[PDB]
């Protein structure tokens, strides 16, 4: 049978799904969550052989190890060990679309393991094996005898081996198919890998055992009283002497307990469940769970004889919380949530899709430290430990069925087909059966990008029946279908409508009030963090705060799915789609994370942390009003640090304890502040600091900040008359100016400053010229490709208009001697094929002090596409160790992504002024700068700039960061104006109108001097 | 206005005057205006204006220049938005064209007098033998701002000698969501901090 080409066969001999079991035989060990002798890990070294198709596997392999096999670590993805290539495809299936068939060439992973079984496990009870994750379908043999089969790469497959094993040595044989009919439901936008990639374990259960248990917590009107109800089912030898006792603990204290014999209430004409029992425990003043304060109790489920013999015990962490939608709002414990979420795939740059605790913890810490309170499992159930971690550390979770059929045409072709209902059903029901007792899970999701089919409606209803405690969401088919309790669009913009036919993406604000609509709206994916992105992020947060029914969203996405490759010298480098010979592929579309693959932050992370702050501030006079956005906790680990500085020079500062109740306000009146009359801008900066460490943060962690310009003293002080006058010398080809030890040379044929000397030292490698283009960002390119150009993308519009190829034609260049200075005046026109795109008019005034004031006025044709920037650029001869500036920072910031930046005096190593995005583009800008120092130079004005060892040309011509090479000197880009970067999505122009350079005429001025 | 600087230079084909002034109040500097006037062989006068506005002072009603011309002319002709009065936040109905009206149509007789008759988006303005070119907003009439702000009923206004000309690089919106609470939208307040405009005055 080719069971892997039959959506009607999704398993053979598989045991029922259930919540996490450990079969403890001592209740204290179950209460403490210590390891159980009845639950062994089979992870470790296994034997593996790769075949090009299942037809190539020799039958001998069932009975004995293949000499040519290799010993490898399990869990693992075989692509990670180099057996075959991982493939990066977004939408288009990695196989020919012809359901339910797969390629006859289908990579088969033959895994095996010789392991030991203690005789005692075989003397009584049941011994099962558990494979938490096998991608994508597999057959299992034990001691050469066929056991069974399983599909669904993302949930555990359990088989009873009781009758196949023998005391001592036993051998498993697992034949894993890379492709199967299950593949048609696994088209998520990620690397296509395969293997036994989650844990393998062996569990001993008694013959009479706990087969399932469900825990519910319901409350009174004010949440001061609760009833914990635990339904427990058994399998096995049903006798009157059996009992179940459920006890509830708060630490070492037992807060409640109930014991009852089996036999549930009558449910119908045939009676009730004689194999079930419901225990109901009253709990007064329960400590409530939320992402803010993840209070947990421990529930211990003991199966025992009435006379006192514990048969076995199971247990779980319990979080008392109610989730409900009422009046159009999603409420948690009666209060409306504001979801600071992120979508997170399970990805490691070395291990592929294999997860480990360290990495999960690392992700949770960083999420919380960056003000996220929620995570969506895009787009499948996660490794079991994730849930445990979210329950304990406190994150709200959207648990999502492993169903994505994006590549079908139309997208609901399978989801609307009743023949695919059974396969889809298993993916939904088994997830709910496994994860229904985790308090962190607050919403169930039916899968992703699978259109809207009748199968979704049936499954929607199944969940609503089986688990009324959590809403159900699903974005497919338009994000507001009958299969979702929450309007949950992807990439809908804040104010801009995108009325696609059938599945329009309305502005989120407009969406909420469409005729008859009443549901809450929480974006399942928003703000595509691909490359230099997150422009416009603040716009979303302002809307979420203003509209009650706009309750947040999940950023797309947490971590880049780049994989490590090694060059000739064995040095690692970050690879993306196509870097493994994989084709077709979607190139860099796999990197959309707030953090790099090794968890280093991209600059956008700080923008997200800031907009997602939990304290809002307002300033009136010397009074700061702090407002808490926490719903349940007081600010019991927080203090406010404040500081006032004049142009980066600290004048005063202090700290005040924060004592604000949830949703409360606190007024803090600051001390008599500094009122200096020395020129400059006075800025107040406040930061919320957590003095005490927590489980997820170190003492002193900063959780929020905000700044305000206090008074400004404009400079009116006249500079001192100079003890000199620059001299001009002319030739047909140049204008040379000299002053003291300084000289400037302007080329009369080009019209640009070609060289400058400080002393005898040349300062420039390339002349100073206007620049109207940028090395395109991922959002500038969108989906455009050489082989398939998207004329609507910004990069293509610029290209086609000739921006990158335009040549400066000199229209004027004159030099004049003033009373105390030399003035050079120039004008240039940039044209393309007959079209004048931009005109640059400037003056350079060099005075007796040695400073050079440059004034620039640019005209931009109203009918050419708005340019990426309006600025100057040059390659300086100097390479200096540091960069010091008075302006926004310290991190990279762009006009539409600068709220998190603060104005101060910053000073960093040159290399931190470059952001190493995997796919190189314009990067490292800093905006709102008044003064920049680099080596001997100082530039003053009101501009944005970037400075690094890489020209815009090189960045635009290089596809991978590891191929960039430092150029001679330092490339400096100083812009009067720079276009937003966008990012509401990375496939349609997303720079908001207010961030486009469409004014027509632009003026900027800089003074360059030496120090 | 306090002078900070006033200089004159001769260039190959022109004369350049440079000035800088500070506007202050109770010892605070509110605004700083830096300009150049460049008069060439053609007789055109090119004015460049760069203004600084303290971040802590309220955003100003406008950033422009003004003068009382000695001449009184019959018509006003401009290449800009019109033909009727239009302001930044109330100019969608106006069209860009060449308009020509009697001077009095350049004044709006609001019963309670105030700033009135501006036209925005103007590239060229003609009055008598004078011509102003640039990208500005303007109003022109027989009444000074002072008079309008001192007068409560239009019937009491009197034509002053000559013509008052207000030429603005930038003008604040007028608002109107209500008339009892500030209603000019942020995008229409002059809060940029630094403003640049330039005009050419010449004889026609
Ligand atoms: O679905 N699509 O045809 C499609 C075409 C071009 C660009 C994005 C796109 O879909 C978008 O792709 C991004 C890539 O990070 C995510 O996978 C997102 O879920 C998906 O809707
Ligand atoms: O899906 N992608 O990430 C992606 C990256 C670059 C170029 C095309 C591309 O996807 C392609 O997008 C086009 C729309 O433009 C269609 O949706 C197509 O089905 C999808 O595969
Ligand atoms: Mg099958
Ligand atoms: Mg007991
Ligand atoms: Mg025995
Ligand atoms: Mg998809
Ligand atoms: Mg491709
Ligand atoms: Mg701010
Ligand atoms: Na809201
Ligand atoms: Na992606
Ligand atoms: Na506190
Ligand atoms: Na590039
Ligand atoms: Na008046």
Q: Minimal Cα–Cα distance from B197 to chain A, Å?
A: 9
Q: Which long-range contacts (C-beta less than 8 Å, at least 24 apart) are formed by A780-786?
A: A780/A868, A780/A921, A780/A982, A782/A986, A782/A987, A782/A988, A782/A989, A783/A987
Are residue A588 and residue A604 in the same domain, yes or no?
A: yes
The per-type count for chain B, helices as H runs and strands as E runs, is: 1, 11
User: For residues A870 and A942, what is the distance between their CA atoms, to the nearest angstrom?
Assistant: 13
The 10 Å Cβ neighbour count of residue A452 is 24
How far is residue A986's CA from residue A982's CA, in Å, rounded to a whole number?
8
Q: Provide Rg for chain B, Cα atoms.
A: 18
Boundaries of domain holding A20:
1-206
Angle CA A778–A871–A881, to nearest 5: 80
Residue written as token pair 């296994």: A46
* Residue among A780, A804, A802, A805 at smallest CA distance from A793: A780
Q: How far is the CA of A960 from the centre of ligand 12 (A)?
A: 7
Tokens at A38, concatenated: 């009845």
Residue B189: exposed, middle, or buried by beta-carbon count in 10 A (0-12, 13-18, 19+)? middle
Residues 6+ apart with CB under 8 A from A168: A116, A117, A119
**In a 3-state reduction of DSSP, which class is residue A450?**
coil
- Give the closest-approach CA distance of A568 to chain B in angstroms: 54
Residues 6+ away with beta carbon under 8 Å from A411: A405, A449, A450, A451, A476, A477
Q: B135 — contact with chain A (CB < 8 Å)?
A: yes
Does A819 lie at the interface with B, CB-CB under 8 angstroms?
yes
Locate all alpha helices (DSSP H) within B27-184, ordered by sequence.
145-150
Helix, strand, coil % in chain A, rounded to nearest 5: 15, 40, 45
CA diameter of chain A: 113
CATH of the domain at A84: 2.60.120.260
Domain boundary among A270, A304, A321: A321
- Among protein residues, the one whose CA lies closest to atom 13 of ligand 2: A783
Most distant CA atoms of chain B, gap in Å = 56
Residue B73 and residue B103 in contact, taking contact as beta carbons nearer than 8 Å: yes
What's the A937 CA to ligand 4 centre distance in angstroms? 78
Measured in angstroms, the resolution is 1.8
DSSP at A593: -
Which positions in chain A touch B50 (Cβ < 8 Å)?
1003, 1005
Tell whether A1001 is within 8 A of chain B (Cβ).
yes
Identify the CA nearest to A709 among candidates A757, A647, A761, A661: A647
Residues whose CB falls within 8 Å of the CB of residue A331, separated by 6 or more in sequence, listed in order:
A322, A323, A324, A325, A337
Residues of B in contact with A857 (CB under 8 A): 198
- The residue among A586, A612, A638 that closes a domain is A612
Kindly list the distances between the CA atom of residue A772 and the CA atoms of A332, A775, A871, in Å, as whole numbers in the listed order.
50, 11, 7
Contact A398, A522 (CB under 8 A): no
Number of domains in chain A: 5
Co-location of A258 and A218 in the same domain: yes
Binding-site annotation: residue ranges of B for substrate: 180
Interface check for B9 against chain A (CB to CB < 8 A): the answer is yes
Q: Which helix (H) or strand (E) holds A39?
A: strand A39-41
The phi and psi torsions of A99 (rounded to 5 degrees) equal -55, 140
Distance of CA B154 from the midpoint of ligand 13 (Å): 8
Pocket test for ligand 1, best of A505, A987, A989 (most atoms within 8 A of CB): A987
Tell me which residues of chain B, numbers 184 to 203, contact chain A at a CB-CB cutoff of 8 Å.
187, 193-194, 196, 198
Give the CA distances from residue A107 to residues A54, A103, A104, A436, in Å, rounded to whole numbers and listed in that order. Answer: 8, 9, 9, 35
As given in the structure block, the two tokens for residue A921 are 């583009």
- How many Å lie between the centroid of ligand 2 and the Cα of residue A783? 6
* Ligand 1 within 6 A of CB of A90: yes
Token pair in block for residue A276 = 């079930």
Provide the 8-state DSSP code for B163: E
Residues tagged in the binding site annotation of B: 180
Task: List, in sequence order, the alpha helices (H) in A707-855.
Answer: 778-781, 794-801
Tell if the CB–CB gap between A1003 and B55 is shorter than 8 Å.
no
Please name every residue paired with A858 in a beta bridge, in sequence order, or none if there are none: A840, A1002
Angle at A947 between CA A941 and CA A949, to 5 degrees: 155
Q: Which helix (H) or strand (E) holds A425?
A: helix A421-435
| Token pair in block for residue A493 | 């913009």
Residues A478 and A422 in one domain: yes
Q: Contacts from A246-249 at CB under 8 Å and sequence distance 24+?
A: A246/A279, A246/A281, A246/A299, A246/A300, A246/A301, A246/A302, A247/A299, A247/A300, A247/A302, A248/A281, A248/A283, A248/A297, A248/A298, A248/A299, A248/A318, A249/A31, A249/A297, A249/A298, A249/A299, A249/A300
Contact B29 A714 (CB under 8 A): yes
- The whole-angstrom separation of Cα A605 and Cα A594 is 5
For β-strands A339-343 and A374-376, DSSP reports them as parallel
Contact A743, A884 (CB under 8 A): no
> Residue A333 has which token pair?
């414990």
- For ligand 1, atom 8, name the residue with the nearest CA: A987
How far is A382 from A980, CA to CA, in rounded Å?
36
CA dihedral B95, B100, B102, B108 (to 10 degrees): 20
Residues A952 and A498: beta-carbon distance below 8 Å: no
* Residue A767: CB atoms within 10 Å: 18
Burial of A123: CB neighbours in 10 Å, binned 0-12, 13-18, 19+ = exposed
Kindly report the backbone phi and psi dihedral angles of residue A725, in degrees, each rounded to the nearest multiple of 5, phi listed first: -140, 125
| Residue B55 to residue A681, Cβ atoms within 8 A | yes
Same domain for A91 and A221?
no
Report helix, strand or coil for A153.
Answer: coil
How many Å apart are CA B106 and CA B140, to the nearest integer? 6
In 3D, which of A995, A9, A907, A896 has the Cα closest to residue A536? A896
Helix (H, G, I), strand (E, B) or coil at A851: coil
CA nearest to A1005, candidates B194, B53, B88: B194
Residue B159 forms contact with A (CB below 8 Å): no
Residues 6+ apart with CB under 8 A from B141: B103, B106, B107, B116, B117, B163, B164
- Count of CA atoms in the C-beta half-sphere (13 A) of B40: 8
- Please state, in angstroms and rounded to a whole number, the distance separating the CA atoms of residues A127 and A162: 5
Question: Residue A800 Cα, ligand 4 centroid: separation in angstroms?
Answer: 78
CB proximity under 8 Å: A 699-738 to B: 709-714, 716, 718
Same domain, A734 and A860: yes
| Ligand 1 in reach of A755 Cβ (< 6 A) | no
Q: Residues with beta carbon inside 6 Å of ligand 2? A: A 90-92, 586, 589, 783, 785
Residue A173, beta-bridge partner list: A112, A141
Cα distance between residue A21 and residue A18, in whole Å: 8
Residue ending a domain, choose from A295, A321, A347 = A321
**Phi (first) and psi of residue B169, to 5 degrees:** -70, -40
How far is the C-alpha of B1 from the C-alpha of A995, rounded, in Å?
Answer: 35
> Tokens representing A894?
């762009």
Select the residue of A713, A818, A1005 nearest B9 (Cβ to Cβ).
A818
User: Are A1005 and B5 a contacting pair at CB < 8 A?
Assistant: no
| C-alpha dihedral sign at A981, A984, A986, A988 | negative
The experimental method is: X-ray
Distance CA A664, CA A659 (A): 9
Residue B32 to residue A1005, Cβ atoms within 8 A: no
For position B145, which CATH number holds? 2.70.98.10
Whose structure tokens read 């600010």? A635
CA distance B8 to B27: 29
Q: Name the token pair of A22.
A: 């450990």
Q: Indicate which ligand has the atom closest to the C-alpha of A692.
A: 11
Specify the 3-state DSSP secondary structure of A931.
Answer: strand
Q: What ranges make up the beta strands (E) of A759-820? A: 761-762, 764-771, 807-817
Judged by DSSP in three states, A781 sits in helix
8 Å CB contact between A629 and A616: yes
Q: Token pair for residue A759?
A: 């002393």
CA A365 – CA A924 distance, rounded (Å)? 26
Who surrounds ion ligand 7 at CB < 5 A? A 584
Which helix (H) or strand (E) element contains residue B167? strand B163-171
Helix, strand and coil content of chain B, in percent to the nearest 5, comes to 10, 55, 40
A602 CA distance to ligand 12 middle (Å) = 17
Contact A249, A255 (CB under 8 A): yes
Q: Would you tell me how many other CB atoms lie within 10 Å of the CB of residue A905?
A: 17
The H or E element containing residue A457 is: helix A454-466
Which tokens belong to B107? 């004044």
Residue A508, helix vs strand vs coil: helix
Task: Give CA–CA dist A318/A658, Å, rounded.
Answer: 31
Whether residue A100 is preceded by a cis peptide bond, meaning omega within 30 degrees of 0, is yes
Round to whole Å and give the CA distance between A633 and A732.
76
Q: Which of A947, A945, A946, A964 is nearest to A955 (CA)?
A: A964
For tokens 């005075």, the residue is A847
Q: How many Cα neighbours within 13 Å face the side chain of A557? A: 21
| A823 near B CB under 8 A | yes
* Strand extents, DSSP E, A864-1000: 869-876, 882-889, 902-909, 926-934, 937-948, 970-978
| Residues in chain B closer than 8 A to A1005 (CB atoms) | 50
CB nearest to A714's CB, from B9, B50, B54: B54
Three-state DSSP at A201 gives: strand
Tokens (6 digits) for A955: 């960045």
The 3-state DSSP class for residue A391 equals helix
- Interface membership of B179 toward A (CB under 8 Å): no
Residue A403 gets which letter from DSSP? Answer: -
Measured from the alpha carbon of residue A101, the closest ligand is 3
Q: Say if CB A582 and CB A575 are below 8 A apart.
A: no
Collect all residues of chain B within an 8 Å Cβ-Cβ radius of residue A1001.
Answer: 135
């Amino acid at each position: 049978r080719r069971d892997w080409e039959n959506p009607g066969v999704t398993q053979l001999n598989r045991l029922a799904a259930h919540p996490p079991f450990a079969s403890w035989r001592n209740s204290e060990e179950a209460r403490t969550d210590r390891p159980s002798q009845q639950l062994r890990s089979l992870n470790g070294e296994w034997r593996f052989a790769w075949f090009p198709a299942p037809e190539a596997v020799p039958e001998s392999w069932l009975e004995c190890d293949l000499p040519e096999a290799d010993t490898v670590v399990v869990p693992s993805n075989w692509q990670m060990h180099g057996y075959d290539a991982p493939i990066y495809t977004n939408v288009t299936y990695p196989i020919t679309v012809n359901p339910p068939f797969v390629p006859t060439e289908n990579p088969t992973g033959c895994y095996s393991l010789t392991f030991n079984v203690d005789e005692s496990w075989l003397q009584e009870g049941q011994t099962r094996i558990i494979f938490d994750g096998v991608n994508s379908a597999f057959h299992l043999w034990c001691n050469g005898r066929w056991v069974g089969y399983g599909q669904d790469s993302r949930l555990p497959s359990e088989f009873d081996l009781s009758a196949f094993l023998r005391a001592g040595e036993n051998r498993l044989a697992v034949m894993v198919l890379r492709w199967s009919d299950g593949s048609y439901l696994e088209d998520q936008d990620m690397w296509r890998m395969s293997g036994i990639f989650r844990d393998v374990s062996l569990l001993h259960k008694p013959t009479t055992q706990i087969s399932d248990f469900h825990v519910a917590t319901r409350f009174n009107d004010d949440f001061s009283r609760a009833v914990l109800e635990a339904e427990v089912q058994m399998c096995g030898e049903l006798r009157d002497y059996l009992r179940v006792t459920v006890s509830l603990w708060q630490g070492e204290t037992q807060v409640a307990s109930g014991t009852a014999p089996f036999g549930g209430e009558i449910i119908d004409e045939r009676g009730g469940y004689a194999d079930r029992v419901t225990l109901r425990l009253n709990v007064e003043n329960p400590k409530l769970w939320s992402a803010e304060i993840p209070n947990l109790y421990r529930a211990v489920v003991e199966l025992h004889t009435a006379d006192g013999t514990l048969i076995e015990a199971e247990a779980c962490d319990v979080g008392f919380r109610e989730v409900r939608i009422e009046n159009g709002l999603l409420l948690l414990n009666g209060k409306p949530l504001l979801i600071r979420g992120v979508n997170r795939h399970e990805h490691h740059p070395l291990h592929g899709q294999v997860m480990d605790e360290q990495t999960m913890v690392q992700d949770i810490l960083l999420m919380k430290q960056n003000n996220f309170n929620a995570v969506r499992c895009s787009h499948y159930p996660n490794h079991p430990l994730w849930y445990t971690l979210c329950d304990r550390y406190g994150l709200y979770v959207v648990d999502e069925a492993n169903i994505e059929t994006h590549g079908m045409v139309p997208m609901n072709r399978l989801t609307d087909d009743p023949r695919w209902l059974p396969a889809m059903s298993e993916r939904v029901t088994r997830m709910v059966q496994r994860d229904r007792n985790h308090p962190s899970v607050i919403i169930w999701s039916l899968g992703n990008e699978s259109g809207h089919g009748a199968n979704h409606d049936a499954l929607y209803r199944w969940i609503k029946s089986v688990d009324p405690s959590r809403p159900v969401q699903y974005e497919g088919g338009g994000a507001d279908t009958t299969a979702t309790d929450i309007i949950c669009p992807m990439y809908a913009r804040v104010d801009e409508d995108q009325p696609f036919p059938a599945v329009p993406k309305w502005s989120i604000k407009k969406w909420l009030s469409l005729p008859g609509e009443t549901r809450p709206l929480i974006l399942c994916q928003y703000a595509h963090a691909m490359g230099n992105s997150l422009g416009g992020f603040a716009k979303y947060w302002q809307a979420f705060r203003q509209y009650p029914r706009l309750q947040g969203g999940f950023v797309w996405d947490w971590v880049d799915q780049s994989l490590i490759k090694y060059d000739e010298n064995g040095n690692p480098w970050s690879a993306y789609g196509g870097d493994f010979g994989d084709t077709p592929n979607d190139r860099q579309f796999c990197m959309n994370g707030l953090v790099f693959a090794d968890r280093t932050p991209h600059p956008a992370l700080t923008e997200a942390k800031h907009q997602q702050q939990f304290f809002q501030f307002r300033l009136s006079g010397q009074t700061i009003e702090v407002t808490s956005e926490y719903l349940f906790r007081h600010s019991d680990n927080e203090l406010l640090h404040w500081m006032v500085a004049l142009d980066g020079k600290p004048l005063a500062s202090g700290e005040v304890p924060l004592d604000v109740a949830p949703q409360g306000k606190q007024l803090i009146e600051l001390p008599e502040l500094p009122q200096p009359e020395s020129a400059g801008q006075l800025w107040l900066t406040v930061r919320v600091v957590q003095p005490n460490a927590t489980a997820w943060s170190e003492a002193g962690h900063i959780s929020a900040w905000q700044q305000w310009r206090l008074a400004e003293n404009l400079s009116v002080t006249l500079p001192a008359a100079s003890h000199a006058i620059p001299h001009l010398t002319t030739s047909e080809m140049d204008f040379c100016i000299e002053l003291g030890n300084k000289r400037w040379q302007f080329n009369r044929q080009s019209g640009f400053l070609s060289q400058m000397w400080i002393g005898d030292k040349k300062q420039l490698l390339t002349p100073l010229r206007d620049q109207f283009t940028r090395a395109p960002l991922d959002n500038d390119i969108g989906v455009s490709e050489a082989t398939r150009i998207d004329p609507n993308a910004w990069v293509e519009r610029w290209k086609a208009a000739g921006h990158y190829q335009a040549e400066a034609a000199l229209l004027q260049c004159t030099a004049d001697t003033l009373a105390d200075a030399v003035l050079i005046t120039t004008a240039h026109a940039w044209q393309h094929q007959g079209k004048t795109l931009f005109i640059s008019r400037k003056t350079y005034r060099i005075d007796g002090s040695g400073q050079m004031a440059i004034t620039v006025d640019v005209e931009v044709a109203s009918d050419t596409p708005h340019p990426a920037r309006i600025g100057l650029n040059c390659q300086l001869a100097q390479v200096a160790e540091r960069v010091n500036w008075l302006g926004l920072g310290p991190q990279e910031n762009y006009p539409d992504r600068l709220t998190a930046a603060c104005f101060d005096r910053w000073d960093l190593p040159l290399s931190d002024m470059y952001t190493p995005y995997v796919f190189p583009s314009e990067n490292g800008l800093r905006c709102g700068t008044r003064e920049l120092n680099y080596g001997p130079h100082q530039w003053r004005g009101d501009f944005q700039f970037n400075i690094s060892r890489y020209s815009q040309q090189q960045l635009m011509e290089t596809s991978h960061r590891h191929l960039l090479h430092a150029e001679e000197g330092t490339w400096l880009n100083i812009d009067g104006f720079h276009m937003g970067i966008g990012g509401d999505d990375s496939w349609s122009p997303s720079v908001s109108a207010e961030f486009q350079l469409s004014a027509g005429r632009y003026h900027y001025q800089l003074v360059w001097c030496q120090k």
